[PDB]
Amino acid sequence: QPQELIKPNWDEELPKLPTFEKNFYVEHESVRDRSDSEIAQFRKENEMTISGHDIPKPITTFDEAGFPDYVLNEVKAEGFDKPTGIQCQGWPMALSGRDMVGIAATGSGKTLSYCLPGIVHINAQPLLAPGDGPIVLVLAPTRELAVQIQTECSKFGHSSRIRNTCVYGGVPKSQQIRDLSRGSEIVIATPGRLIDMLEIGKTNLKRVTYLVLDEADRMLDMGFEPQIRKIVDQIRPDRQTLMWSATWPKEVKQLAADYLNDPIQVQVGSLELSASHNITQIVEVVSDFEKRDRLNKYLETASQDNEYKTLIFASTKRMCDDITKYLREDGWPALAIHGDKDQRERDWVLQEFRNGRSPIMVATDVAARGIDVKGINYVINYDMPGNIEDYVHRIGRTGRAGATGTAISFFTEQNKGLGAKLISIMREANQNIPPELLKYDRR
Amino acid sequence: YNQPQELIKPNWDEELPKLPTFEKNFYVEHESVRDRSDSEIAQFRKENEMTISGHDIPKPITTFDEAGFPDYVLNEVKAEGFDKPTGIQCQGWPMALSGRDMVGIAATGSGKTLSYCLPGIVHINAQPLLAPGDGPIVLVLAPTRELAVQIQTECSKFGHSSRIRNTCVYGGVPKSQQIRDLSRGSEIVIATPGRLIDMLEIGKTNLKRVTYLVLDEADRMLDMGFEPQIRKIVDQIRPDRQTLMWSATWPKEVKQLAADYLNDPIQVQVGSLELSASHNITQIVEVVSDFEKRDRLNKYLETASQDNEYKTLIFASTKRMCDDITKYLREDGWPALAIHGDKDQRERDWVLQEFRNGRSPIMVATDVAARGIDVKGINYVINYDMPGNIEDYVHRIGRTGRAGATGTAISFFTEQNKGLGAKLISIMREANQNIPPELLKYDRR
Amino acid sequence: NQPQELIKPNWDEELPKLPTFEKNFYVEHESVRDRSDSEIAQFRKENEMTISGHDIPKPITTFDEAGFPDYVLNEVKAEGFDKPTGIQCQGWPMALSGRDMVGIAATGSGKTLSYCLPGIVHINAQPLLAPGDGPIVLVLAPTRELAVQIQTECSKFGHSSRIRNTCVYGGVPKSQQIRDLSRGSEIVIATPGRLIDMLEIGKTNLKRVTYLVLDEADRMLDMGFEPQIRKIVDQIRPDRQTLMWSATWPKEVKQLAADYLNDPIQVQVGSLELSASHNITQIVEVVSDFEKRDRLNKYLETASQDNEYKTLIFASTKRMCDDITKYLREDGWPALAIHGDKDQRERDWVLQEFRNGRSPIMVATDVAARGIDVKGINYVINYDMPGNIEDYVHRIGRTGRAGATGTAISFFTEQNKGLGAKLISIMREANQNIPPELLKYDR
Amino acid sequence: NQPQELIKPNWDEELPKLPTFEKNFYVEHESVRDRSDSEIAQFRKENEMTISGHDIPKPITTFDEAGFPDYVLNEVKAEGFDKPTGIQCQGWPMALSGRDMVGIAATGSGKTLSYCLPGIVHINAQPLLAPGDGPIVLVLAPTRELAVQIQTECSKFGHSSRIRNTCVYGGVPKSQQIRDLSRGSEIVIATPGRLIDMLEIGKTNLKRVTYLVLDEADRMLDMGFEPQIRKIVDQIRPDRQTLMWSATWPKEVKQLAADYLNDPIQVQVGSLELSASHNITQIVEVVSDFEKRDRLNKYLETASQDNEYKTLIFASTKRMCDDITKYLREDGWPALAIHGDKDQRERDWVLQEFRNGRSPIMVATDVAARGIDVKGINYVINYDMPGNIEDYVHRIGRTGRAGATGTAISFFTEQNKGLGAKLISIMREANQNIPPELLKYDRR
Ligand SMILES: Nc1ncnc2c1ncn2[C@@H]1O[C@H](COP(=O)(O)OP(=O)(O)O)[C@@H](O)[C@H]1O
Ligand SMILES: Nc1ncnc2c1ncn2[C@@H]1O[C@H](COP(=O)(O)OP(=O)(O)O)[C@@H](O)[C@H]1O
Ligand SMILES: Nc1ncnc2c1ncn2[C@@H]1O[C@H](COP(=O)(O)OP(=O)(O)O)[C@@H](O)[C@H]1O
Ligand SMILES: Nc1ncnc2c1ncn2[C@@H]1O[C@H](COP(=O)(O)OP(=O)(O)O)[C@@H](O)[C@H]1O
Ligand SMILES: [Mg+2]
Ligand SMILES: [Mg+2]
């Protein structure tokens, strides 16, 4: 805050900055030749379609990607195989130095599609020369989703000794300045918390050559574009930008044309959320004050069965700090999982929820990602997500074998933008729709 | 928070049947180890000069794939790029992964740290989840702040696959931030005995899940009077745990301690006091230095500054005195860079980059920080502090004068390390020694 | 610094430099004198009274028969109290007469206010406090949880006559405890440990103390408080009025009464016997402090099998009562707590949720659970053990009223050796079986 | 560096390795010799001199008569006083010649400037401080409030030849004591208690101390500081020049001189005694700590009845003098205070408001109320008592010079029993009535 705004004149300062390389792709032995026929059948096998110039070719296995061995032995240490559809096509795009757009399901590997090409980008550049800022900068919509990607970059950047900082709201900055002063090759920042440390000048965006935007759709819902364009005007314009999000409305396409240089977009996601038919959806029009009483009403209704197993969902981590701080004081056993928690800390909470030691657990969307806890009654959406991909995945946590379940959601008028497609999720699963939810179905 | 006290010493003869069950042995003698048979091993022992004395000691490994390590950890030594594991790790791993109490003595250029860190992770993953309010399962004890964090930097690089969390708790610093990391749970704790007891008295940790205890550098740790505090820490750990001792000096106190805390121990020694002792460096250690140390250093740098471009290497034993030495001379107008273990994980390679590029002729470093560097071309290596053994001294001075066949070594010796005066002349008198007018006191019997 | 820490005054020549005060304020009423010598004779015998002294007054029968002014009488009026306790029926006119007295009764019948109401009329008879003068009333309690309740009830009758009271006690920072003494206070309820300290640091003086109270004398002698008390009364004028109060009458309490009281008049009211009703199964486990949470989790899962259990965990202090309920909520258990320092009226919302099965588990202290007939209690768990057995009997006494069945699981440690002799003495009176591990601690 | 430290250094082997300083700078301007040998003899006991030594120099008459440079002499002129004190008339040639010397005089004599000015010329012969070097001049003082009096008194003659001076003393947070020592100072003012606490943390060093002074070594010896200075004087070069100063001549002060001074030379300037010129009604009251606030209030109602009363309260510490000042102000009594740390010139504005009767009550410390003519004051209450009986005689001495009447209310506690023995003989010689309760602390 105390003094800075000035935007630099990059027409004048680009000849003053050092030179960097962005293209690294290796076009490994196997891919060519196949050739140009079985890729087509493989492409739209896993929902791939191309629209761009000089398309690279998809990969099949990890070892066919031009990743070095210090990062390739970490995919092995993490036990994965068969990289995700976007990782099979997005990586040859990213290692070629191209600006690109990537949309896929939230739960797919959009994160590692830019995290791994960012490590090769860093290690090709000289040492950090203290007082130099980061080389990779990724901007995220919310505080605790920045930490999920920051726990995903620490999994593959120890080999290269890469230092990483995460800058986000809601916390004292006196700890993040002492992580930035030690140097950090990757910085994960929220636009609100990042600018006011560039205005006090404890970091620079002068070495940022590889910029990536995770979940740009969510980014637009908080009015953060006045804050991102202000700092993207503080970076060298010849960097490589990588867009990533889950949806494809008209507003992400507007943002792509303003920052990307000849962008290439990857589409893997696809409408046909099936809304597995064995879940009763009850959506209720409520307000800010009306909850915490409907929850007691639906918790004591769940309490009558034994042993019930309830899962409450929130979209922030401090709404889970609020809900849990309220159930426990009313006399309800409650456990929580959010992003600022540690996996092994979150894995003990997941273990105690399966053996039925406490029937209630509050969770966030990022924490409740790829979990199989069978036995779940009464999944409660105390909040509603920003998209219809998380809703189906939120309620998708009920009923595989027994083939029955209920999902209690608390809906309010500031969530109507998804109602129109929400009824079509209830309408395909042949669920009853309340007359007060038809208020959010027109045009 | 605040609480000042507790003391409890438990009666383990009565509390053992109430404790859960755990496994310590895991190692399975992979293909090429068996069998040879006992003809190949015979001189590979003295090829790697390792000395075993116990009963039913397992047989050494040669490959990484020959250790009973899973692939999720074996794919991490690959990402670190290591081949041909260290000699002591080639025999210490079959011993330690087999759940036996052991002591290992070798020079601090070996893999002593990872010879017990890697077997400790499989020990962790064989136990249930941490069940909050449970303390660590592995406890490693270190003498000082900056040795513990090197232990933490080798456990951090190998715990992502298993998501193992590790904390390091050490004295001389406000307690306010390590308590918030202990509460989130940590499977491995690396502690100095000085503060470790100081967190059991106000109670943010327990030693009741500790099944795999390690004592690193027990010789130097014993030299600072930490044993009266180690009595308190081992009296609160299950007596049936697995203890693994490691040190460099092989006294004359371990033999006592090893047989007071280890149950049926197995010792392996790889090092030997007989090698190198490089004669191509003029070693000039004569300065009493009690508190002169800064005054001679400017004068010994004023003589070094005359040549150009000189390249000087200052050595310290602690980080808090290694951030100091740079803090003392830079204010007199001397270009200095600092290198230690606590900070500067990636930063020390930039300082080493500016030491090769000739950007600053002076660099202060500690023994843990100056590990495996070939930055040679270094005149006038100064031991402003002195190490605990005669193998760190030789490696301190050993980084000068190989090709050009000349070098100098200035050390500052004082009564606070007189226990090593006897051993340095044994290398100095082989080294065509100087006159000890001030070591006179420190050679007899 | 806070030095020099004992100085004994010379009362023999500095007492003639201190102001004069009066101790006798009672004026016998029309219906009290006389009846006579038969109605007061029997009335002491139908209330188990036993007097011993010189010039013992006639006991009271109703509130207005006591020589109380009207501004304190209209306080018991608004409090809606019926037919004051026997110890109040005779304890009042003895205290109002300026006489040193001893009152023996069960912990809770009338003892606290037996000296508070006569202590207030003692206060309003003196000039204002002239800031930098200490208190007129000095109350000594052994523990923080007991000293708070004295202040919690002295603050209930000291607002008509504007009156301030303070608690000073160990384990807590003293900075705030001095900023209330900075305001001056007529009454102080003090722990010997923290009282000796603030006198050595010169943040209060005992020069205005003329009316001394020693509550829970049997506790203080069990905790080695006499050598600290002997130093406290070294700084009080010898013509003070000292009032002793206790629950038992061993040889060390009545030696302490003879050493400090001038012509004391004893009154014994209670029954002195602990019958330990036999329809509760008393299970005692000799454990240490690090097993207590594991076995609580295992005894709670045993109660969890019932439908529906209602357990009461017991702690002695506020700090662990906060620990226990902190730890249960993180283990997945529904937990409520009630203690004295906090929870004056919010304490009663907890009792209201615990009676109705809103929450099956409630943690409490011994003082906080005083006089609650919350029937429905199975499995009262003594996570702590008190210093005295009268509280144990009342702790376990909360299990089985009509159905006449219950369980009590106690956690016994080496630190509780002082009560083992009296713990088994009642466990065999109730003819419950004793496990061998606490036979070490008999006699 | 925060271990324990100050193990004795080996000076027979470490002294040849330090740079060198010379101590002799006195020039003995020419006509000081000769007079001679009888007109010096008349000079000696006009000022009550007592000399015992070898090769004794001759004393001074005027400021111009000393072998002082001009940069130091232009300030003795700037204060506007002539004719330095009898102890300054010989103490300067003793100290400026670099010989170990002890001077005894009353506390209030010119004992101070006999060491301040010869210490600065000793500095100016040496190079700049070369940060990380400790001080050259070290003087030891017994009390915080006496240590600040000399460092506020060193701030008068060391500005021109720029010399920085710091005061380090116990009972206060050390975080500001190290940050002025970080500035470096040729003169540092230290209490034995807080000096060892800065040598063990290694934020000052005693390697360059060449000019040691022991001011008021008598009172320092009574507080058990001797085992601590032998700890301190063994951490400094043995070839230094030491300067002792005190008012009393016990057997322990001279055995203290033979143990630390090398070939010491002795001078006294005063025919001792304090005979408590008698004009004050002394009412001693054997009291304890918790009643004194009410006891002073009753003595204030007794003074407040008079008009216009003017009372002076005395304390020994600054911190217990701010307590007294804003403790009766809570009782409704207007009080003003004077101490050594603070109130540089407002010490003088409160003094002007005290005589003209804008405020009748004033609390004071010992050093802050020394050498003031504030007469018109009755009712001086010694709420605290000093460590010796020489300050108290002056403390009560503020009551009655012309009018020939005065009162002195003293508060005595077993915290002051060390002074009870001689308190009675001063009251018995002033033939004041003696309370029965104070006779407890007199003999054996
Ligand atoms: N090929 C793969 N095999 C197994 N797990 C994977 C693979 N790719 C990613 N993951 C896991 O999925 C998660 C990554 O999800 P993320 O990419 O953040 O979702 P989004 O698509 O919203 O970015 C991480 O937990 C990662 O470990
Ligand atoms: N597989 C390996 N091959 C070769 N060197 C290794 C290997 N693993 C670790 N090292 C090196 O050996 C050292 C391991 O630390 P170590 O020397 O055991 O600490 P200490 O010996 O003081 O206990 C480090 O310097 C590290 O670079
Ligand atoms: N006359 C009365 N009528 C009804 N309740 C009373 C009366 N006197 C005291 N009480 C109750 O008894 C308690 C007073 O303290 P008490 O329990 O008597 O301590 P002790 O048991 O040590 O005497 C209060 O909780 C109050 O509600
Ligand atoms: N030559 C002088 N002329 C006038 N005043 C002096 C002279 N020397 C010292 N003083 C005064 O004496 C005080 C110095 O303290 P001092 O009284 O010497 O303490 P001590 O009694 O311990 O010697 C200063 O306040 C100063 O004003
Ligand atoms: Mg080691
Ligand atoms: Mg009571």
mmCIF file with all atom_site columns, C-alpha atoms and ligand atoms in Angstrom, chain C residues 111-112 215-216, ligand 6:
data_model
loop_
_atom_site.group_PDB
_atom_site.id
_atom_site.type_symbol
_atom_site.label_atom_id
_atom_site.label_alt_id
_atom_site.label_comp_id
_atom_site.label_asym_id
_atom_site.label_entity_id
_atom_site.label_seq_id
_atom_site.pdbx_PDB_ins_code
_atom_site.Cartn_x
_atom_site.Cartn_y
_atom_site.Cartn_z
_atom_site.occupancy
_atom_site.B_iso_or_equiv
_atom_site.pdbx_formal_charge
_atom_site.auth_seq_id
_atom_site.auth_comp_id
_atom_site.auth_asym_id
_atom_site.auth_atom_id
_atom_site.pdbx_PDB_model_num
ATOM   1 C  CA . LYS C 1 111 ? -21.600 -22.314 54.859 1.00 0.00 ? 111 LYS C CA 1
ATOM   2 C  CA . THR C 1 112 ? -20.638 -19.789 52.180 1.00 0.00 ? 112 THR C CA 1
ATOM   3 C  CA . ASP C 1 215 ? -13.147 -21.758 54.358 1.00 0.00 ? 215 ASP C CA 1
ATOM   4 C  CA . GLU C 1 216 ? -12.399 -25.424 53.599 1.00 0.00 ? 216 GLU C CA 1
HETATM 5 MG MG . MG  E 2 .   ? -18.265 -23.135 51.382 1.00 0.00 ? 6   MG  E MG 1
#
